[PDB]
Amino acid sequence: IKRSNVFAVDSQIPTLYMPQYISLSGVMTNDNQAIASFEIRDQYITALNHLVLSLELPEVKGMGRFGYVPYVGYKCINHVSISSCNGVIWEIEGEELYNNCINNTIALKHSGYSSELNDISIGLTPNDTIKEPSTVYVYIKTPFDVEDTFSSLKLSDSKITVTVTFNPVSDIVIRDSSFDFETFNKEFVYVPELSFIGYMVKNVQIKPSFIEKPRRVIGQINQPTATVTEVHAATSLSVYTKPYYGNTDNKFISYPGYSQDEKDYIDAYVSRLLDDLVIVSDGPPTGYPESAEIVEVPEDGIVSIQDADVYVKIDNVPDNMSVYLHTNLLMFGTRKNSFIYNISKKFSAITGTYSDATKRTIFAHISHSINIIDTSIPVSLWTSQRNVYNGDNRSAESKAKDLFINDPFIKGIDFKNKTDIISRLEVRFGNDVLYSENGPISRIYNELLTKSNNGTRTLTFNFTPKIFFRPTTITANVSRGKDKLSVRVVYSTMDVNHPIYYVQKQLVVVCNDLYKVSYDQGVSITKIM
Amino acid sequence: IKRSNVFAVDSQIPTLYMPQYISLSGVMTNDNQAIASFEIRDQYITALNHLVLSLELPEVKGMGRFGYVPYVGYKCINHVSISSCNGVIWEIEGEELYNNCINNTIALKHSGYSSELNDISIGLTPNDTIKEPSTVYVYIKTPFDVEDTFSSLKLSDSKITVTVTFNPVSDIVIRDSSFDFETFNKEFVYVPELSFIGYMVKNVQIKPSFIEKPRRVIGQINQPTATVTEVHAATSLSVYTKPYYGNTDNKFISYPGYSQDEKDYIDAYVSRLLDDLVIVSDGPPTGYPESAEIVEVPEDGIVSIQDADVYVKIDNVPDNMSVYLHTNLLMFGTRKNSFIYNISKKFSAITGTYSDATKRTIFAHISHSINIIDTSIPVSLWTSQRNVYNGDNRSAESKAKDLFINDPFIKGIDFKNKTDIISRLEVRFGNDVLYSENGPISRIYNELLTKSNNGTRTLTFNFTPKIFFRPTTITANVSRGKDKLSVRVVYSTMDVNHPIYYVQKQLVVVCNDLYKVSYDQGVSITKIM
C-alpha cells in the first residue's frame, strides 16, 4: 500500500518577485460626463491586480435635507475600461461591477455605507454643514483577482490605461426641494485616485489565459423581450428587470437612510404617513385639500372606511380638542365607481399619546398592512391623468418633505427587489428552447452556488475550476443558426387600480463571453469563436 | 534554482459537458404519511447533484392565531432516500439533513424564514386570510455536492428514484386553540417539485468513489445510554439529546415568532406574563382562581414575596383605582412546606404608565431574572400531579392564548439548546474507552472546525481532504470485539422543585459510515468492512 503523505509537503520555491502598493492620480475630462484616465507605464511592473478607486467627497453646506445613497462609491461609477495599445482588454458597466461585488460585505462597507454618509441630514442655515468631507474606496473586482498572482494582468512591456466614467452627481444624492442642488451640481467635481498591487517579477514565464467579459443588453421600455447577438462562447447568462422612472419627477414620500431592511423602509413610510393620518385638533383640521375626508373618531374609537374599521385611541387629548382620522390620505382608481386603492384602509389600530408641550401625537403601537411596494410608489403616480381621484390629500408641510431619489442600480419595481414580476422565463439558443421555467428556481440556484443573498435569474454553463481549466461554455452552431440568445418573459399581472401597475419596466440581459488573452506583441484579447 | 511558476498556469481542457436545470413533478401517496416519488430516467443525463425541493404552501383562512415554524421547508421533511435498481444509494433523516444545513444561512433563508411566514398572525373572521400562498425551497445537501462535478452522482444508464417522506402538518404549524386545526389538517396536502442540476457528458470516464451515509440511533426515554452496532468504518460520531414532550399537550405560554434570539424568547415570555402580573383595578381584581394571591402595592411601591422584594411603580393611575401585584402567578413545588418555584419572585422592578383610553398598563422598564428555560417549560408541567400547588393562576384570557408547538428538531431542554444537560460523556469502541470528557470540549472543536454556531458533541476521525483521498475512519477489530460504539452520559442534576426537571429526554447518537460506490452494472454501494 503506497500511501500519500498527508503530514508533510515538498515546498516549491516560487518565482522571485516583490509586491508593491501603487497609487496614481488621474487626468479628468468632461452633458459633460466626467472621465478619469490613469496611465500605467513602468518597466519594472510586470503584473498587477486588485484595483481600488479613491474618491474624496467634499464638505456639503447649506439648507435642506441631503444624504448620499448607500454604496455611493459604487453608484457613482458609470463604466470602467482597461486598455492597452491593441485595444480594450476588459471593461464593465457600473451596474454589473456592483452586481459582481454585491456579496463582498467588506467592499460594500468601504465604498460608503454608514450613518454619517447615508442619514438624511438637515441643514438649518446657509452656513450649516450638512456633511463633512470624507473618502470612499471602490474595489474594482476584475477577472485578474480570482487566483492572486496566477490570474494577474501581465504588462508585456506595454502601457496600460484605466478609464473611469462617472455618473452625474444627481445619481448619488438623496435630497429634498429645499436643498440648492443647482449650485451643488455646478460646484461638485469628482477627485479620483487609482491604486493597485504591482508585482516586480524576475524572469517571468508567461502563458496565454482566458478571460470572461460581461456584455449587457437592455430591452425597450415595457417590452418583454431582449436579445443578445453574436454569442459563440458564453459561460453564463443572467436576466433581471429595472424600473424606468423617466415618466416621473423621481420624488418619493420617504427613504429610510442608513437603515436598509424592508422593515426599515416600511417604518420610515408609516412614520411619514402618521403625521397627516391622525390629527388632534380644535375643530375640523385645516390646511388640507378639499378632496380630503377628515372624520372625528367616535367614543368607541372605531372609524369605518367602506368595509375597513380603523381603531384609533390617543391618550391625553385636551378637553377642547378631538381626534380626527384621514380616511383618504392617498387614493387611486381608474374607474369612477369601482375599486379604489386607499392608503388609509391599510391601517387597523393606531394608539399613542398627545404631548401638550410639543403639541404633537407621539405614536406607540401601530397595526397596519403597508408593504414594500407602497414605500416604492413614486409621488407622480398618485396624481397621474389615469387617476380619477385627487390622489395626494396630504398637507403642504408633508408634501414639502418628499425626496428626490435617482439611484441607478434599482432592480424590480421596489427598492428591495423583493417582488418578482417575472412569472415565466424562456431562453432560446437560435430557434430551439434552451431553458424554460415558471418559478425562480434559477435564482435559487444562483444564490445557492454563489453564496449570495441578492441573486438574479441566471443560467450558468460553467462548473469547472476558474483558471486552472479552460471554462466550459455553451458553444455556437452558426450552421444551425445557434449564434444568438433570445429571452422572452411573462410579467406578473398586477391590479389595474394599483399605482405600481404603471411603473415602467426594462428587461436586462447580461452575457459573459469567453476571450483568449495572448501576450505576444503586448497584451491583446481575441473573442473565442 | 528551479522555481515553480506562480504567475501562469497551463490550462487543462476539461471533459466536454453541458449543464441543465431540470424540474420534476412527483407522485404523491399516503396515519397516512405523505410520500413523494420522483423518477429520473434520461439517457442523456450522465450525472447530477444539487437537489432542491419546492413546496407550495396554500392560503390559510379562518379565525385564530396561526404561524409556521422557522425553516418550515426543512421541518416538514421526515426522510429522503435516493435509490437505483440495486437498492438505496444514500438516505438521511430530516433532523440530520437540517443539521448538515444548519450552517448554510442562504439555504435556511430559502426554506422559509421571514416575518410573513413566521409571525403568529391573527384571523378575526372565518373569511379572514391569515397567510397567503407561498413557495419554499429546500436544498437537500448530498455528498455529491462537495466538489461539484468531481463528486456528482453518475447514472450508469440506470433509473434513479428520489423518495421524500413528509412529517404531519401539525409539526410545522404553531397555533392556538381558536384555530380550526382539524379542518386545516383534513385539507392540507403537500405539493412538491424536485429540481437538480444535470450534466450531459461526452465520453465520461468513471471511477469508483467513497460516500459517507449517516446512521441514527435514539435511546429509550430518560436512559443515559445508546449504542450503535455494526460499526466497521466510521468517519465521525455525534451525540446530543432531544426533549420528549409526549407526556404533555405540547402547549407553551409564548413563542417569539420570527425573532429567534434568546433575548427575543425571553421578551415574548415576559410580555405574556405582565398582563396578569400587574393589574390596575377598582378593588381586588376579579377573574382569577381562588389560589391566586393578589396584593395591593403600598405607597413605597415595594411588595415582599418571601425574601423577594418587587418594586412596582405605575404612572397615571386613576383616583378610584389601585395597583395590584400577582405574587404567585406560576408556582411549583413537590413538598408541601419546602422550596417553591415562583415566577413572580423573578421580577425586581416593574414600571409603566396606565392608559385611560385603552384601559391597559403600557410597561416601560422591567428588571427580571427570567431565562430561556422558563420560556421552554410546557404548560402541562405547571399542573402535573407532582405539583402540590395549583400551578397556573393566570386569567382565562391569557390561558386562551397558549400555543401548540410540535417542532420536531428541538435539541436539549430549551428552544435554543442553550443549557447543556450532559455533564460527562464516555464513548467505548468495543469494551475499551475511546473517549471521555466532562466539559463540552468536543462541541467547541466541532464548532471551530466546521465554522458553525450550533455544533454538537462530535468525535471526528477524518481530517483528510474530502474526495481526493479515501477518508480516514476508525476501523473495527471484530476479533477483539471492537465492532460497536457505546455511548454513556451523566445528565446535569436539576433541582427537584423546578418544573424542567420533569421534561423527558432521549439520547441521540449519529454515526457516519463509509461506503464504496461502484458503477459496474448500474450504481451500487457496498459497506466498507
Added chain:
Amino acid sequence: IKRSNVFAVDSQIPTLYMPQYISLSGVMTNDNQAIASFEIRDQYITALNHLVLSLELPEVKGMGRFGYVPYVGYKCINHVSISSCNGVIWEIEGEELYNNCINNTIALKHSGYSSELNDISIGLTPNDTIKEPSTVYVYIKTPFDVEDTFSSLKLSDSKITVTVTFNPVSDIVIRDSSFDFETFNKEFVYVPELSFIGYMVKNVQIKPSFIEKPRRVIGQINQPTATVTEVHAATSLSVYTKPYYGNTDNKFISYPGYSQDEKDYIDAYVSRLLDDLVIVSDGPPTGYPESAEIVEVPEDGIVSIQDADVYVKIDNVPDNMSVYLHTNLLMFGTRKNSFIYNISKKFSAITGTYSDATKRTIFAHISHSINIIDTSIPVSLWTSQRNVYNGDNRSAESKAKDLFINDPFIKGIDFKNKTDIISRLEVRFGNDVLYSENGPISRIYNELLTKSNNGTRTLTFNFTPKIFFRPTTITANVSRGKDKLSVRVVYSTMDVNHPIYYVQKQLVVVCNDLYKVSYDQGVSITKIM
C-alpha cells in the same frame, strides 16, 4: 484533444493515522504574574495542532457594579510560548494572538461574549451574586493550523512545553468604586486547562517546513517613530497605535457592556449625561458644584449657550416645579477667554416626560452631536492641570457611577479604533524608502485581502499559497545596510482645546519573520538569513 477528467478522481490512500482530543491540566506559578505550564510527552503522539485553553471563571459575590470585558478569554492572555528541548519553537503576545483571531467570530464567541458575562451587573448586598461561575475557551491559533495535518507540529520524540502567561485580573474586569476589588484580586486565581488534537501516525515521513513568527516593537510614549532591527526575511509588516492611559486613573463615564456598536457606545454615554443635563426640580437644583450654570428653560423651550440653542420640552411637569438645563456639564479649555469644549452645546433637542411616581424624567427623542471620541475621554482628562475651568460639574451621584476600564487591546484613541490618527506613514528598509502613503490605502488592502473588518495598516510581501510554497519575503542586504525596518508617522492634528489631544500614544510595529523548522535531533527552528 486529451481532456482532463473533471467527473472522477483517483483517490489517494493517505497516511494511516488516528486523531484524538487530549486535555491537560497545568502547573501554576506566580507583582507575581500567573504562569501555567503544560507538558506534552507521549510516544504515540506524533503531531498536534488546534490548541484551546479552558478557563474557569469563579462566582463573583458582593456589592457594586461588576462586569467582564468582551472576549475576556483572549484579554487575560499576556504571552504564549511553545518550546522543546532545543528552545522556543513559536511564541506570540496576547495582543497579536487576539489580532490574528479578530476575524474568527466563532472563536471570539467562545472566548466569552454574552450578556451574562459582559453586562455590568449590580450587587446590592454583600451576599448577592453578581456573576455565576462560567467557562470560556480560547482558541490559540498557531501556524500549525492552516493546512490541517500538512502543517501540524511533529514531535520528533521530543517533549513539548506550552507556557501561558496571564494578565492581571484588573485587565479583564470593568468595575465601579463600590466593588471590593482588593478582596476580589486577593482571591482570584486562574484555573486553566489545555486541549489539542493529537495524531497517532503510523510510519510518518517528515520533511522540513517554514514558519512565520510575529515580533513586536513598541515605541516610546508620544514618539512618532519605531524601528525593528535584524530583519532578514519578513513576510509582512503592520503598524498601529495604542493609547497610554498611565497618566490617568483609568476611569470613564460609561461603558455599553455587551452592546459593542459605535451607536451603542454613544447611547450609553448620552444616557449617563441626561440625568444631570436636564433637571425637573422645585427651585434651583441643589447638589451641584459652584461652577455649575443651571438655567431655567423659558416658555419657548429654547436655551442659548453662546451661539448654541438647546430645545428642551418635558411633558407632565408639576405646577410647583420647573425644567432646568445644565449649560456647562463638562467643560474644557486651555486659555481663559478663548475656545471652550462644552458637552452641553452638543445637544440640540431634548424631549421627554416627567414621571410623578418615580420622580424622574423619562427621555424620548434626543438630537445631539456626541461621537465616539467623547465616550472615549478619560475622566481624569476633564480635570487636568491644563484645564483652566472646573471640568466636571456633574452631581456626586453620577460621579459615583464611573467605571474603571483597563482593557489591554485598545487601538487608536477611542474604544472602536474609529478615528485614524495617522495622517502619513513612511517605511524604510535600510535608508531607502520602501513605502509611503497619506491615506489608509494599506489598511483598505489588508481588510480586502484578509476579509476582515478590523484591519490595520499592513505591508504584505507574500502572495503565494501558504504551506505548499516557500513564503515570499522582503530579503535583507547587509552589504547595502538593508537589515532593519524603520517606521515614521505624522499624527493627525487635534485641537488644543479638545481633551482627546492629551491622550498619550504609542506606536506599535509588528514584523513576521520567516523561520525554517527542521526535525533532526528533535524539533528546532532557525532564523532565515
